[PDB]
Amino acid sequence: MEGTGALTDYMNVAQMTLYAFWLFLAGLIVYLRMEDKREGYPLQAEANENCNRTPEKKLGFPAPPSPKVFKLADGRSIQVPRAEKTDYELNTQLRAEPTAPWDGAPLEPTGNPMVDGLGPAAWAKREDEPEVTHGGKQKICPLRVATEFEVGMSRDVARFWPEIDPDPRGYQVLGCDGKVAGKIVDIWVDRGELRPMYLEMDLSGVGSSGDRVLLPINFARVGYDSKVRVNAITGQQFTDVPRLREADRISPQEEDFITGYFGGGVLYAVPGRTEPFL
Amino acid sequence: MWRMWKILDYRRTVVLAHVGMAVLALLIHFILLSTENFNWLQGNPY
Amino acid sequence: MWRMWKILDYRRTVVLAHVGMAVLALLIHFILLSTENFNWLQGNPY
Amino acid sequence: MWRLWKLYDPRRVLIGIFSWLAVLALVIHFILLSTDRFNWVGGAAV
Amino acid sequence: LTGLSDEEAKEFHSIFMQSFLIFTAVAVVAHFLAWAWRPWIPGAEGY
Amino acid sequence: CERPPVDTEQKGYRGTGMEEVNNPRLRDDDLHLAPEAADPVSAEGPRAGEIYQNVEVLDDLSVAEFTRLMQSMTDWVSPDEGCTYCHDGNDFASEELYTYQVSRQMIEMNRYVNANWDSHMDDTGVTCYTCHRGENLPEESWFAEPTPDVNMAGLGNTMMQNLASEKTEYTSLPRNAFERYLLGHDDLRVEGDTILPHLDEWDVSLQDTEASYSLMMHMSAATGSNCTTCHNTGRLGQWDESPEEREISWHGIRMTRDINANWIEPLEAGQPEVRLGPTGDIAKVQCATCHYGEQLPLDGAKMVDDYPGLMGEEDADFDFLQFGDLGTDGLRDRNA
Amino acid sequence: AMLDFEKKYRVRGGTLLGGDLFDFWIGPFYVGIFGVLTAIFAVLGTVLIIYGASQDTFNLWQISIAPPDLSYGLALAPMMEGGLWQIITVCALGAFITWALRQAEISKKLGMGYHVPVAFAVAILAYATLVVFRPLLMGAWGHGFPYGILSHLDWVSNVGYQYLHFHYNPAHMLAVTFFFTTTLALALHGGLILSVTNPKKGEPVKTAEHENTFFRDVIGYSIGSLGIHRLGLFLALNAGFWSAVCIIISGPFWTRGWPEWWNWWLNVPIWSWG
Amino acid sequence: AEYQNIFTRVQVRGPTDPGVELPAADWPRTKGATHSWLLGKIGDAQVGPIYLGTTGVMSILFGIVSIVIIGMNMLASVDWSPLEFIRQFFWVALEPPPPEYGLSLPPLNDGGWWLIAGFTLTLSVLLWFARTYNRARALGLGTHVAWAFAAAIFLFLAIGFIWPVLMGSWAKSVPFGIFPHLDWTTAFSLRYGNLYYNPFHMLSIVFLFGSALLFAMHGATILAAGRYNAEREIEQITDRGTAAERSALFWRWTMGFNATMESIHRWGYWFAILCVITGGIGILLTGTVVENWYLWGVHHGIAPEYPEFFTPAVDPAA
Ligand code: BCL
Ligand SMILES: CC[C@H]1c2cc3[nH]c4c(c3C)C(=O)[C@H](C(=O)OC)c4c3nc(cc4[nH]c(cc(n2)[C@@H]1C)c(C(C)=O)c4C)[C@@H](C)[C@@H]3CCC(=O)OC/C=C(/C)CCC[C@H](C)CCC[C@H](C)CCCC(C)C
Ligand SMILES: CC[C@H]1c2cc3[nH]c4c(c3C)C(=O)[C@H](C(=O)OC)c4c3nc(cc4[nH]c(cc(n2)[C@@H]1C)c(C(C)=O)c4C)[C@@H](C)[C@@H]3CCC(=O)OC/C=C(\C)CCC[C@H](C)CCC[C@H](C)CCCC(C)C
Ligand SMILES: COC(C)(C)C/C=C/C(C)=C/C=C/C(C)=C/C=C/C(C)=C/C=C\C=C(C)\C=C\C=C(C)\C=C\C=C(C)\C=C\CC(C)(C)OC
Numbered sequence A: 001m002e003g004t005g006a007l008t009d010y011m012n013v014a015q016m017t018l019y020a021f022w023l024f025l026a027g028l029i030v031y032l033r034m035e036d037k038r039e040g041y042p043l044q045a046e047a048n049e050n051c052n053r054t055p056e057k058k059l060g061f062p063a064p065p066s067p068k069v070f071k072l073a074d075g076r077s078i079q080v081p082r083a084e085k086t087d088y089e090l091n092t093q094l095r096a097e098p099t100a101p102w103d104g105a106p107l108e109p110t111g112n113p114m115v116d117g118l119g120p121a122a123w124a125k126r127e128d129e130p131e132v133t134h135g136g137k138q139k140i141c142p143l144r145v146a147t148e149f150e151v152g153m154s155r156d157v158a159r160f161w162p163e164i165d166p167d168p169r170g171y172q173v174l175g176c177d178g179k180v181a182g183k184i185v186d187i188w189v190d191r192g193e194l195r196p197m198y199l200e201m202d203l204s205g206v207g208s209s210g211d212r213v214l215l216p217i218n219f220a221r222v223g224y225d226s227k228v229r230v231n232a233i234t235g236q237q238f239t240d241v242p243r244l245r246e247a248d249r250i251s252p253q254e255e256d257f258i259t260g261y262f263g264g265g266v267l268y269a270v271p272g273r274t275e276p277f278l
Numbered sequence B, C: 001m002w003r004m005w006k007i008l009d010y011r012r013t014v015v016l017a018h019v020g021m022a023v024l025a026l027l028i029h030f031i032l033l034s035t036e037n038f039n040w041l042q043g044n045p046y
Numbered sequence D: 001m002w003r004l005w006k007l008y009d010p011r012r013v014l015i016g017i018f019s020w021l022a023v024l025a026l027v028i029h030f031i032l033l034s035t036d037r038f039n040w041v042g043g044a045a046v
Numbered sequence E: 001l002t003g004l005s006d007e008e009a010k011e012f013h014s015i016f017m018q019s020f021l022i023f024t025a026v027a028v029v030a031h032f033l034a035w036a037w038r039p040w041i042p043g044a045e046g047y
Numbered sequence F: 001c002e003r004p005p006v007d008t009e010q011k012g013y014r015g016t017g018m019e020e021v022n023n024p025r026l027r028d029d030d031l032h033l034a035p036e037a038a039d040p041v042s043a044e045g046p047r048a049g050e051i052y053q054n055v056e057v058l059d060d061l062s063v064a065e066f067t068r069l070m071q072s073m074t075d076w077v078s079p080d081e082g083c084t085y086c087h088d089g090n091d092f093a094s095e096e097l098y099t100y101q102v103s104r105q106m107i108e109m110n111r112y113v114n115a116n117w118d119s120h121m122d123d124t125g126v127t128c129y130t131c132h133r134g135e136n137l138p139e140e141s142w143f144a145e146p147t148p149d150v151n152m153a154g155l156g157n158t159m160m161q162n163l164a165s166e167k168t169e170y171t172s173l174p175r176n177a178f179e180r181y182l183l184g185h186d187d188l189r190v191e192g193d194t195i196l197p198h199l200d201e202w203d204v205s206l207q208d209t210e211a212s213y214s215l216m217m218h219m220s221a222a223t224g225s226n227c228t229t230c231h232n233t234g235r236l237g238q239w240d241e242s243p244e245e246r247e248i249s250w251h252g253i254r255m256t257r258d259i260n261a262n263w264i265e266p267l268e269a270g271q272p273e274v275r276l277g278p279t280g281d282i283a284k285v286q287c288a289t290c291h292y293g294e295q296l297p298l299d300g301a302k303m304v305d306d307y308p309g310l311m312g313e314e315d316a317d318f319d320f321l322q323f324g325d326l327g328t329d330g331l332r333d334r335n336a
Numbered sequence G: 001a002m003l004d005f006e007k008k009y010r011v012r013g014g015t016l017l018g019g020d021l022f023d024f025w026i027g028p029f030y031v032g033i034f035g036v037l038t039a040i041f042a043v044l045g046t047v048l049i050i051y052g053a054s055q056d057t058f059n060l061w062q063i064s065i066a067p068p069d070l071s072y073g074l075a076l077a078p079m080m081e082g083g084l085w086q087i088i089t090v091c092a093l094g095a096f097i098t099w100a101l102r103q104a105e106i107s108k109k110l111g112m113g114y115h116v117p118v119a120f121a122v123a124i125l126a127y128a129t130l131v132v133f134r135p136l137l138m139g140a141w142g143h144g145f146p147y148g149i150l151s152h153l154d155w156v157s158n159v160g161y162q163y164l165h166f167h168y169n170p171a172h173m174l175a176v177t178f179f180f181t182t183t184l185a186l187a188l189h190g191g192l193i194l195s196v197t198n199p200k201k202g203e204p205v206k207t208a209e210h211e212n213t214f215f216r217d218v219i220g221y222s223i224g225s226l227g228i229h230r231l232g233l234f235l236a237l238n239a240g241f242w243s244a245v246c247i248i249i250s251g252p253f254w255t256r257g258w259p260e261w262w263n264w265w266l267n268v269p270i271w272s273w274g
Numbered sequence H: 001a002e003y004q005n006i007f008t009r010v011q012v013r014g015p016t017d018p019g020v021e022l023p024a025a026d027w028p029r030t031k032g033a034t035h036s037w038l039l040g041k042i043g044d045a046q047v048g049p050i051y052l053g054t055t056g057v058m059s060i061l062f063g064i065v066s067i068v069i070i071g072m073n074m075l076a077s078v079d080w081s082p083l084e085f086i087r088q089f090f091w092v093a094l095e096p097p098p099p100e101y102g103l104s105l106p107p108l109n110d111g112g113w114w115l116i117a118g119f120t121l122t123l124s125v126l127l128w129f130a131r132t133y134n135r136a137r138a139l140g141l142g143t144h145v146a147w148a149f150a151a152a153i154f155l156f157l158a159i160g161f162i163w164p165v166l167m168g169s170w171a172k173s174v175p176f177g178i179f180p181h182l183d184w185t186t187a188f189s190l191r192y193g194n195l196y197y198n199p200f201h202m203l204s205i206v207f208l209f210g211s212a213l214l215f216a217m218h219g220a221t222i223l224a225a226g227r228y229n230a231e232r233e234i235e236q237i238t239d240r241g242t243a244a245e246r247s248a249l250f251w252r253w254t255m256g257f258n259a260t261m262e263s264i265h266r267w268g269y270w271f272a273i274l275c276v277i278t279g280g281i282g283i284l285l286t287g288t289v290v291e292n293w294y295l296w297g298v299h300h301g302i303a304p305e306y307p308e309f310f311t312p313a314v315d316p317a318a
């Protein structure tokens, strides 16, 4: 053909602009997949996957990039993927047995999967130092120390329509089996996220009234009848929720312990959840 | 009706009155421009 | 009239005046360029 | 009427007044540019 | 209540009303000149 | 809002999305009913040009067929008025009324299109009733959009655009599409016929494209069609990818342009002031003046053969290509 | 092979069907019963597509499995007259539905909510609107779109111009608004997270304080870490849903030009001015 | 019966966050900040304060001038009737210059007001770009948002300025109206032969659809893993929690590959800005180096061929 844009008898400028973008899109796709390989890589090929019956490491394609250094606010240059998390995962002895020796067989937990961190109950290896705001305050703290927060975004809504702006303090907690686990005594708020994160409760229903346990808010269904319904775990199972090292702080690790325990209830709280519909 | 200011916040009411009257005065003036008999800049016979 | 600078911040009035006059100067110069009697670059008869 | 300046920050009131006058003056000038009789740059006869 | 006092507010009000007087007087003159150029209130016969 | 059921028809190959969807509950069913034709009266004896004092168009009709035609035209254009709609009382040889001169032009035009425009109307032809439908005026005429001689330094200059108009089927498209194409003969093509640009040979503006778009908006709603019935919109300027409706409606454009430029506009001088549009122009024919929202006007009823007198003689000068397409021999000087 | 943290999560349970029989991983993919089904459905549909391609042309863009003629109504057609399209439709529908059920098995196993399968059910709803629901209401499977890279673009073109200006479709203007707004929100969300975790070189990784401060500095409001993902899901799901609405009302509930639909607005007694 | 992380049930209100401290040359922020219950259900409840500096003020002034010009011309086109303005609100527009003016400066009422509105609108969006850039730098953040915005600016400039300039006429540009700029969008495709066959329009749609796909995937995944504080994504990038692992494992098990908490936002960022960049390139190619996109597609063998169903029309004027 002829006209403006012709490069040969067949090639034209728009077509070669397109292939130019193909080369860029590939280089971007390869670059994006490398950024994908900074967590969990290199892959751990177990012995039972390889014909030589030896554990190995697979880079995949594209191979992972070099380690990446995140300088942190408190003056700590962390490298990603983090060495301590990889070392914890590779050395932890799981309390589970594969349902079959071949690769891809699911693990069947031996003891109690909820307290052993198996499957939906699992936790990552995180820091034990409680998080801080940019200004140095305690990031996730209960309302008894984070006294500048009051429950309820709108005072008028909380006073005249408390159903849609509730205050769950003093609410009874029920498990997936309808049994009473205790009473909510406090609310934990993230000073950065400006949201409730945990509902601290006592175990007055299934244990000691003086015991304190954190219930993650995303596992709590704060009702309209002064009852909080947790579908994750049975009411009797609130006693084994991991306790805080310090009654007034939570490390990111304990957040993974506590949310992990409730997440494990989705499969292990009662018999039959693991079992299919049919 | 000085008690009206124990109900309606006077600072916000004054501002919203000026804003609201700005829209209404502009709207009424514009409506008169659109009519044939009251567009003073066009000067049609009455 | 220096008491005006105890009300308004002279630092941010100066910045505002300069950027405000910049918008108006471009607007007026461009309006004049879009008229037949004052586009000094087209140079139509007056 | 002087108590208005205790109710509001005078800097805010001035900024609001001027911001309004600038838009109002521009709307009025644009309106006159729309009409035949008061388009001064167009220079149309009466 | 802003940081102004009764004396400070009275000072702003007087200067503000004087500023309104000067600004309005300039506008009124600008309207006498505009009326002399081309009047804007049409008669019953129009223009 | 509408609802199912909807009548569907396939216009192109399966999967091309070329389909017509119609709502059967939206059809009038009375506007499109063809009147029952009168019985064939005799064609014997002397012609009308030998009987009547003032006859110039229907000269070669019998006395019986002349009066049958006159009664048929009365039902078609003025049933509630009678013969005195066009005739000055009892003096039928008088041409005083403007409706008489207009109707004399309307017979000459009705005869002309029925004899020369089978490239569009095939064999159906048209009758006074195809356009009038029992009314003094066709419900579906158009006037020229007013041209207000803009300020050139003012504000709000719509360039025939940016207002919802029934002319443009409630789009903001140009409202003067009828003037440019149904009375004028401006080019309708918007697509370059080459892969690569030749900007100095083909540079149609988007404003011209939207004007051709606005005519297509009308031509769709005016015949109860859509863009798909005349086009494969993936390849809009490919004639071999278009149904035969596109070729037919091509002549519908040039016939409507012929009706407006050569037969309707000459009547503008002697119209009453009440009849004229805002610009002072005569009401003109668009695609819906005959179709009224249906592909086949009056359900495709062939009414012409029942009435001798509405068919003329096939002109030797007719081209259908002499209306703005390689020549302007079929158009008068004025157009618009 | 597995991610260096992946092993502890690979447990038994979470299936809806199949139980232990299909509850395993092949490489990285969890299989499940709906993975076997989605594999059979996907391979069947893809191989049937290639067979249809072998009968007209192998050019990738010009491959087209077209729906049957409208004259067929809802009847199943001969294979080379749109019956091949109909089988591919039931294969693709099954492939999509078992894909979402499989993502539901994966959701339960990792203790996640069912947001992903449900958000995918909206996408499946839009395809079902295109090939099942709308062809049903109009009365023929031939109203669905052809299975071809460039042949389904002509379908979109012609179906859009069946209403003479598809931009005036009120539900389509809403869906386009949701599509434009969600990629705007995606640009802001992706950019803000990268801007915090990747500040200027020599700066610490910032906080959620800086994220809220940035948008309060720019537009005067910040939706937060949690709000951006609710709104992001909301905008994209409304984009899919109003896509379904805009196409389901084009033909079953509106047969005229879409610009004419706005005649009610032009006739509101409040602002007729005539 | 599980909580779906769709609305925040329990909210807690504290003092208004005044924002992170700025350098000691920035303008003071506004003092106005209030909390909204309705907005607090979806997310952060605080509305305001807002920063306004040199770039912000000048962007607002240039933008207000543009909106006033468009609005007053829109209102003037309906004879100044506010009622007729509402009736015709979607149909009115500030019309671009007619083709006869080329790239010259046309009279105010013949596209001159359009050119001024386009110039001030371009200046406001460019200053807003500098504002987004500087607000990020003032907080010590990366300039990713600004460059993503710059990518959207480039399509805006390609459509309205660069492509009309490359074509030699301001008529080719898009009017300031709701339905009129939709008329421009359709007519553009009609004129240059079905923009569907433009490959960079195809790619533009790929990244636009993939952006909605990505936000739906990512937003649903963060809500689904909200039980493990997934939405605190900055903590998960610097300290990989179980939520980051379950999000990655979910997609690794589904489609065989995953991302990270950080790399997902690189995927979404690039999909958002590539949509608008291939859009700009596709617009710049048509009219300049491609006349008809269907004919271009025929040449490169991408146009499907259709068997006979109807009698083909023949151009009478052939
Ligand atoms: C000239 C034609 C008309 C027009 C006619 C139409 C018609 C007809 C339609 C649209 C539809 C749409 N139009 Mg439109 N449209 C026009 C111009 C535009 C413009 C513009 C630039 O002006 C924009 C931005 C849009 C935008 C849109 C969207 C709102 C919508 C498409 C998104 C969607 O449906 O998601 C939904 C996403 C899906 C349906 C994808 C389904 C995903 C399934 C579940 C999974 C598939 C997996 C796959 C097989 C996996 C592959 C294998 C692996 C990769 C290995 N249109 C013009 C004016 N438009 C469509 C719509 O809304 O339908 C719902 C539609 O039918
Ligand atoms: C509704 C909001 C948006 C959305 C959401 C969405 N999509 C999703 C999800 C979500 C939440 C997933 O979780 C799921 C996923 O896991 O993605 C990685 C998915 C997905 N969306 C996909 C694609 C996709 N989404 C699209 C759109 C959208 N997805 C919306 C804009 C589009 C468009 C607009 O075209 C496409 C192409 C996949 C990547 C994936 C679903 C994968 C799947 O279902 O796999 C099943 C098995 C297969 C191999 C599919 C093919 C099997 C068939 C038998 C053959 C092909 C038949 C088909 C009819 C061919 C048509 C071709 C022609 C049109 C050219
Ligand atoms: C990746 C490409 C996508 C994208 C990205 C994108 N857009 C962006 C950004 C990014 C990354 C920004 O950072 C920037 C932004 O601010 O985001 C919130 C923006 C933005 N994208 C916007 C719009 C937008 N983006 C669009 C599209 C897209 N944006 C793409 C799909 C579109 C479409 C689909 O057409 C639109 C319409 C803006 C909301 C914003 C940039 C705003 C801007 O430039 O404003 C300039 C200034 C003005 C217009 C001045 C007038 C404004 C007010 C009227 C002034 C008020 C005066 C006074 C303060 C008050 C007066 C009243 C009194 C009574 C009080
Ligand atoms: C009367 O109204 C008041 C005052 C009350 C306020 C109301 C205002 C209202 C209601 C305004 C309504 C506005 C609307 C609805 C606007 C709609 C706008 C739309 C949809 C716009 C869509 C697209 C427009 C585009 C993309 C415009 C592009 C134009 C560009 C990019 C122009 C670029 C021009 C430049 C860079 C100028 C260059 C000038 C130079 C100097 C180069 O010339 C020599």
Ligand code: HEC
Binding pocket: F073, F077, F086, F099, F100, F102, F103, F106, F107, F110, F126, F127, F128, F129, F130, F131, F132, F136, F137, F138, F141, F259, F275, F282, F283, F284, F285, F289, F290
């Ligand atoms: C469509 C192409 C037409 C056909 C066929 C016939 N007429 Fe017509 N006629 C047509 C138009 C567009 C108009 C103008 C209507 C308007 O609003 O001004 C007319 C007008 C007349 C008139 C004048 C009516 C009046 O002004 O009161 C008459 C008397 C008339 N037409 C008669 C007529 C007859 C007798 C026809 C058949 C032979 C005929 N018309 C055909 C459009 C069309």
Ligand code: HEC
Binding pocket: F188, F189, F190, F191, F192, F212, F213, F216, F217, F219, F220, F223, F225, F226, F227, F228, F229, F230, F231, F236, F237, F245, F246, F247, F249, F250, F253, G161, G164, G165, H190
């Ligand atoms: C038949 C009644 C038609 C309908 C319905 C629509 N179109 Fe059409 N279109 C038709 C013809 C006969 C022609 C050729 C006109 C000529 O004189 O050459 C056209 C032409 C176009 C064009 C110009 C394309 C070109 O040749 O370069 C366009 C852009 C166009 N048509 C678009 C179009 C649209 C969008 C329609 C639906 C609303 C539509 N047309 C309907 C006949 C008919």
Ligand code: HEC
Binding pocket: F051, F052, F053, F054, F055, F056, F057, F058, F059, F070, F071, F073, F074, F077, F078, F082, F083, F084, F085, F086, F087, F092, F093, F099, F100, F101, F103, F104, F107
């Ligand atoms: C307008 C549409 C007409 C109506 C209604 C009627 N007539 Fe008519 N008539 C009309 C015209 C234009 C002409 C001129 C004929 C020509 O070809 O030039 C006529 C003519 C007659 C005549 C002939 C009179 C003569 O020339 O001496 C007669 C007798 C006649 N018309 C009778 C007639 C009757 C009885 C009608 C009522 C039913 C009638 N006409 C209605 C136009 C129109």
Ligand SMILES: [Fe+3]
Binding pocket: G189, G193, G229, H218, H222, H233, H265
């Ligand atoms: Fe995110």
Ligand SMILES: [Mg+2]
Binding pocket: F161, F172, F173, F210, H175, H180, H181, H183, H184
């Ligand atoms: Mg337009």
